[PDB]
Scaffold this active site. Structure first.
Site, PDB file in Angstrom:
ATOM      1  N   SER B  35       0.867  -1.179   0.000  1.00  0.00           N
ATOM      2  CA  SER B  35       0.000   0.000   0.000  1.00  0.00           C
ATOM      3  C   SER B  35       0.899   1.223   0.000  1.00  0.00           C
ATOM      4  O   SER B  35       1.445   1.610   1.034  1.00  0.00           O
ATOM      5  CB  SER B  35      -0.930  -0.045   1.196  1.00  0.00           C
ATOM      6  OG  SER B  35      -1.901   0.965   1.111  1.00  0.00           O
ATOM      7  N   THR B  60      -2.427   1.918  -4.975  1.00  0.00           N
ATOM      8  CA  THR B  60      -2.295   3.357  -4.990  1.00  0.00           C
ATOM      9  C   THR B  60      -3.525   4.036  -4.388  1.00  0.00           C
ATOM     10  O   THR B  60      -4.646   3.509  -4.398  1.00  0.00           O
ATOM     11  CB  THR B  60      -2.126   3.861  -6.438  1.00  0.00           C
ATOM     12  OG1 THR B  60      -3.199   3.430  -7.268  1.00  0.00           O
ATOM     13  CG2 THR B  60      -0.838   3.383  -7.057  1.00  0.00           C
ATOM     14  N   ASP B  90      -7.040   2.089  -5.212  1.00  0.00           N
ATOM     15  CA  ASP B  90      -7.979   1.904  -4.106  1.00  0.00           C
ATOM     16  C   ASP B  90      -8.926   3.093  -4.026  1.00  0.00           C
ATOM     17  O   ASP B  90      -8.945   3.849  -3.068  1.00  0.00           O
ATOM     18  CB  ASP B  90      -7.159   1.720  -2.829  1.00  0.00           C
ATOM     19  CG  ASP B  90      -7.952   1.319  -1.603  1.00  0.00           C
ATOM     20  OD1 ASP B  90      -9.177   1.115  -1.704  1.00  0.00           O
ATOM     21  OD2 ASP B  90      -7.324   1.213  -0.524  1.00  0.00           O
ATOM     22  N   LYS B  92     -12.324   2.988  -4.160  1.00  0.00           N
ATOM     23  CA  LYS B  92     -13.552   2.784  -3.400  1.00  0.00           C
ATOM     24  C   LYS B  92     -14.776   3.456  -4.048  1.00  0.00           C
ATOM     25  O   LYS B  92     -15.498   4.226  -3.426  1.00  0.00           O
ATOM     26  CB  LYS B  92     -13.384   3.181  -1.925  1.00  0.00           C
ATOM     27  CG  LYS B  92     -12.281   2.395  -1.210  1.00  0.00           C
ATOM     28  CD  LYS B  92     -12.273   2.604   0.301  1.00  0.00           C
ATOM     29  CE  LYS B  92     -11.441   1.577   1.056  1.00  0.00           C
ATOM     30  NZ  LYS B  92     -10.004   1.643   0.737  1.00  0.00           N
ATOM     31  N   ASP B  95     -20.796   5.241  -5.650  1.00  0.00           N
ATOM     32  CA  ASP B  95     -21.827   6.123  -6.175  1.00  0.00           C
ATOM     33  C   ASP B  95     -22.757   5.271  -7.060  1.00  0.00           C
ATOM     34  O   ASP B  95     -22.546   4.066  -7.259  1.00  0.00           O
ATOM     35  CB  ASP B  95     -21.185   7.351  -6.864  1.00  0.00           C
ATOM     36  CG  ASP B  95     -21.992   8.650  -6.700  1.00  0.00           C
ATOM     37  OD1 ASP B  95     -23.241   8.618  -6.884  1.00  0.00           O
ATOM     38  OD2 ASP B  95     -21.365   9.702  -6.437  1.00  0.00           O
ATOM     39  N   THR B  99     -22.712   7.649 -12.345  1.00  0.00           N
ATOM     40  CA  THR B  99     -21.622   8.497 -11.882  1.00  0.00           C
ATOM     41  C   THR B  99     -20.287   7.752 -11.886  1.00  0.00           C
ATOM     42  O   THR B  99     -19.276   8.281 -12.348  1.00  0.00           O
ATOM     43  CB  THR B  99     -21.940   9.029 -10.480  1.00  0.00           C
ATOM     44  OG1 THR B  99     -23.033   9.938 -10.645  1.00  0.00           O
ATOM     45  CG2 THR B  99     -20.748   9.734  -9.849  1.00  0.00           C
ATOM     46  N   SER B 150     -11.402  -3.237   7.876  1.00  0.00           N
ATOM     47  CA  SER B 150     -10.550  -3.498   9.031  1.00  0.00           C
ATOM     48  C   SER B 150     -10.756  -2.531  10.193  1.00  0.00           C
ATOM     49  O   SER B 150     -10.213  -2.758  11.281  1.00  0.00           O
ATOM     50  CB  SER B 150      -9.069  -3.402   8.596  1.00  0.00           C
ATOM     51  OG  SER B 150      -8.780  -2.149   8.000  1.00  0.00           O
ATOM     52  N   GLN B 208      -8.000   2.305  12.703  1.00  0.00           N
ATOM     53  CA  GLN B 208      -7.393   1.138  12.074  1.00  0.00           C
ATOM     54  C   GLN B 208      -7.074   0.106  13.140  1.00  0.00           C
ATOM     55  O   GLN B 208      -6.665   0.443  14.248  1.00  0.00           O
ATOM     56  CB  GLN B 208      -6.123   1.534  11.330  1.00  0.00           C
ATOM     57  CG  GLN B 208      -5.349   0.392  10.642  1.00  0.00           C
ATOM     58  CD  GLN B 208      -6.126  -0.279   9.529  1.00  0.00           C
ATOM     59  OE1 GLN B 208      -7.251  -0.743   9.740  1.00  0.00           O
ATOM     60  NE2 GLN B 208      -5.519  -0.353   8.359  1.00  0.00           N
ATOM     61  N   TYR B 210      -5.038  -3.811  13.486  1.00  0.00           N
ATOM     62  CA  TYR B 210      -4.113  -4.705  12.813  1.00  0.00           C
ATOM     63  C   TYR B 210      -4.260  -6.147  13.276  1.00  0.00           C
ATOM     64  O   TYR B 210      -4.501  -6.435  14.455  1.00  0.00           O
ATOM     65  CB  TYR B 210      -2.656  -4.243  12.980  1.00  0.00           C
ATOM     66  CG  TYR B 210      -2.385  -2.932  12.287  1.00  0.00           C
ATOM     67  CD1 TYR B 210      -2.528  -2.827  10.912  1.00  0.00           C
ATOM     68  CD2 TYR B 210      -2.013  -1.797  12.975  1.00  0.00           C
ATOM     69  CE1 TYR B 210      -2.318  -1.638  10.243  1.00  0.00           C
ATOM     70  CE2 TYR B 210      -1.799  -0.602  12.317  1.00  0.00           C
ATOM     71  CZ  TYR B 210      -1.960  -0.519  10.952  1.00  0.00           C
ATOM     72  OH  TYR B 210      -1.747   0.692  10.332  1.00  0.00           O
TER      73      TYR B 210
HETATM   74  O1  LIG Z   1     -10.803  -2.074   5.233  1.00  0.00           O
HETATM   75  C1  LIG Z   1      -9.910  -1.408   4.711  1.00  0.00           C
HETATM   76  C2  LIG Z   1      -9.863  -1.002   3.353  1.00  0.00           C
HETATM   77  C3  LIG Z   1      -8.790  -0.339   2.905  1.00  0.00           C
HETATM   78  N1  LIG Z   1      -7.725   0.018   3.694  1.00  0.00           N
HETATM   79  C4  LIG Z   1      -6.555   0.688   3.088  1.00  0.00           C
HETATM   80  O2  LIG Z   1      -5.412  -0.129   3.231  1.00  0.00           O
HETATM   81  C5  LIG Z   1      -4.281   0.655   3.636  1.00  0.00           C
HETATM   82  C6  LIG Z   1      -3.927   0.293   5.069  1.00  0.00           C
HETATM   83  O3  LIG Z   1      -2.725   0.952   5.366  1.00  0.00           O
HETATM   84  P1  LIG Z   1      -1.921   0.693   6.724  1.00  0.00           P
HETATM   85  O4  LIG Z   1      -2.864   0.794   7.911  1.00  0.00           O
HETATM   86  O5  LIG Z   1      -1.270  -0.674   6.596  1.00  0.00           O
HETATM   87  O6  LIG Z   1      -0.906   1.823   6.691  1.00  0.00           O
HETATM   88  C7  LIG Z   1      -4.685   2.116   3.487  1.00  0.00           C
HETATM   89  O7  LIG Z   1      -4.359   2.646   2.198  1.00  0.00           O
HETATM   90  C8  LIG Z   1      -6.194   2.066   3.649  1.00  0.00           C
HETATM   91  O8  LIG Z   1      -6.826   3.120   2.949  1.00  0.00           O
HETATM   92  C9  LIG Z   1      -7.717  -0.326   5.023  1.00  0.00           C
HETATM   93  O9  LIG Z   1      -6.789  -0.101   5.748  1.00  0.00           O
HETATM   94  N2  LIG Z   1      -8.815  -1.027   5.449  1.00  0.00           N
HETATM   95  O1  LIG Z   2     -28.059   8.076  -3.277  1.00  0.00           O
HETATM   96  C1  LIG Z   2     -27.475   8.840  -4.044  1.00  0.00           C
HETATM   97  C2  LIG Z   2     -26.317   9.601  -3.737  1.00  0.00           C
HETATM   98  C3  LIG Z   2     -25.831  10.448  -4.650  1.00  0.00           C
HETATM   99  N1  LIG Z   2     -26.361  10.610  -5.906  1.00  0.00           N
HETATM  100  C4  LIG Z   2     -25.791  11.624  -6.819  1.00  0.00           C
HETATM  101  O2  LIG Z   2     -26.766  12.604  -7.108  1.00  0.00           O
HETATM  102  C5  LIG Z   2     -26.759  12.923  -8.507  1.00  0.00           C
HETATM  103  C6  LIG Z   2     -28.036  12.390  -9.133  1.00  0.00           C
HETATM  104  O3  LIG Z   2     -28.067  12.864 -10.452  1.00  0.00           O
HETATM  105  P1  LIG Z   2     -29.339  12.671 -11.402  1.00  0.00           P
HETATM  106  O4  LIG Z   2     -29.790  11.220 -11.373  1.00  0.00           O
HETATM  107  O5  LIG Z   2     -30.406  13.635 -10.911  1.00  0.00           O
HETATM  108  O6  LIG Z   2     -28.770  13.075 -12.751  1.00  0.00           O
HETATM  109  C7  LIG Z   2     -25.509  12.280  -9.096  1.00  0.00           C
HETATM  110  O7  LIG Z   2     -24.380  13.159  -9.077  1.00  0.00           O
HETATM  111  C8  LIG Z   2     -25.259  11.111  -8.159  1.00  0.00           C
HETATM  112  O8  LIG Z   2     -23.886  10.775  -8.105  1.00  0.00           O
HETATM  113  C9  LIG Z   2     -27.469   9.888  -6.275  1.00  0.00           C
HETATM  114  O9  LIG Z   2     -28.017  10.031  -7.332  1.00  0.00           O
HETATM  115  N2  LIG Z   2     -27.962   9.047  -5.311  1.00  0.00           N
END
Ligand SMILES: O=c1ccn([C@@H]2O[C@H](COP(=O)(O)O)[C@@H](O)[C@H]2O)c(=O)[nH]1
Ligand SMILES: O=c1ccn([C@@H]2O[C@H](COP(=O)(O)O)[C@@H](O)[C@H]2O)c(=O)[nH]1
Lengths: 257, 257
Positions: B35, B60, B90, B92, B95, B99, B150, B208, B210
């Protein structure tokens, strides 16, 4: 004893960002948030300027702009100040606290430097909020928690929604409200913003589902409608914004009595 | 009848990205994902070059780089090809489908152009995967679904985790596995990647938590460890990566029998 937006702006526990928003909603008679879902900075700015008087908020997805720069966001701030609306970056932070603080402050977008509001998913637990706070509290920002989603198959239901409400109510120095489909908190200090809104029934081909302004503000008790394509894809975006503004505002008034 | 990584790479239903990963894991005797949680491109690239032989994957967070450009990612691809590891952004995604397809293809990061793997939260429902597919399938990419997290207070438990597994198993032309703390699918075609890993017990100050490589690969049945600070904050990052690689690899062998 429902309070008006202007009275909610004065509540003892109100967050300053929420108060500013509620005041301008009342002043301008708008509870419409434009979802400015465009890829060109010029279109974003032209929409912000023309629709600014009609909106309480402009919601961005800066990671979709092809020509993002920080100077675009400076120009957007000028328009937000001129027309009086807040800027909400719909980033959906959703990582561990240590990661989201860096994603909020840093990188090329520097979101915290220009966004009045951001949002977060609650799935990581409250560390997501703690991490964002650490950047957002010194910068006098606010956050919305995603308590419900508008899309088909959403898992933000039941105990998940309740967990979002608890997390917000325990982080009230930073969390100012929710993305939700309905009123989820009984505390009037919190704002409810609802996407998935169009005047006509329907959806999209990727799980979006629409409800009307009357349904979500009037019957479901939300505060603000978030509208993207219902405005953006129309020929006359100003007229479309006014239609949505009038719909949401009347629905609010009629529930107020 | 647990299969080796090399045999899993040949399974009838294996995704090509998963097969490529499993082959290089077996060839290099590594089930470690670095990571690379740094803010400077030069540090990212120096880590990728030095640690490349020790890792199966480099994860990344491009939105934390202060000096991101697409040319940095071209250089990272050169290193990934030289040393044989996959690039996992990463991001995540979390939406609605309409989107996330734009967030994956477009904007300034153009994630789909350089990331072998991305990940998504399942909270929006399966439209999140459908939207990403639409970009990722033509670009021969893969996706991981976040089935568990985690961090303290994670809501990715119980029926939520089960929903993630179902969603993956129904989108197997694009979804190649999970972010999870343990084996969550019984289908050997899917990869399990586990963050929240350090050799010593502990956590951070923002939720976090571990667990050790032996615990998560050996006792919890995961495939790959994702390690950030346990490597990044060490003085000698190469030695640290080798410690983690040897720990995760032995834990895998000992469960295989
Ligand atoms: O459940 C999750 C999902 C993703 N990460 C990601 O994994 C890496 C964990 O880093 P570290 O705690 O080993 O530094 C980070 O980039 C974090 O965003 C978590 O730690 N836990
Ligand atoms: O539950 C959710 C959360 C966020 N958005 C966001 O709201 C806007 C909805 O756009 P539209 O369907 O009205 O074009 C988008 O930017 C979308 O990412 C949703 O539609 N629903």
């Amino acid at each position: 004893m429902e309070l008006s937006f202007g009275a909610r702006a004065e509540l003892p526990r109100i967050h300053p960002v929420a108060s500013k928003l509620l005041r301008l909603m009342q002043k301008k008679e708008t509870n419409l948030c434009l979802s400015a879902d465009v890829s060109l900075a010029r279109e974003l700015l032209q929409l912000a300027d023309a629709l600014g008087p009609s909106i309480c908020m402009l919601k961005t997805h800066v990671d979709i702009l092809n020509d993002f720069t920080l100077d675009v966001m400076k120009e957007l701030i000028t328009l937000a100040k001129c027309h009086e609306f807040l800027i909400f970056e719909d980033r959906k932070f959703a990582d561990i606290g240590n990661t989201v603080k860096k994603q909020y402050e840093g990188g090329i977008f520097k979101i915290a430097s220009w966004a009045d509001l951001v949002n977060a998913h609650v799935v990581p637990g409250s560390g997501v909020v703690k991490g964002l706070q650490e950047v957002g509290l010194p910068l006098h920002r606010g956050c919305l928690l995603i308590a419900e989603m508008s899309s088909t198959g959403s898992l933000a239901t039941g105990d998940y929604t309740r967990a979002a409400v608890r997390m917000a109510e325990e982080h009230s120095e930073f969390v100012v409200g929710f993305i939700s489909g309905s009123r989820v908190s009984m505390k009037p200090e919190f704002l409810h913003l609802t996407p998935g809104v169009q005047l006509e029934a329907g959806g999209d081909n990727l799980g979006q589902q629409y409800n009307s302004p009357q349904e979500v503000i009037g019957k479901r008790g939300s505060d603000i409608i978030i509208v993207g394509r219902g405005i953006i894809s129309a020929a006359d975006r100003l007229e479309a914004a006014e239609m949505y503004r009038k719909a949401a505002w009347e629905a609010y008034l009629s529930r107020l009595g």
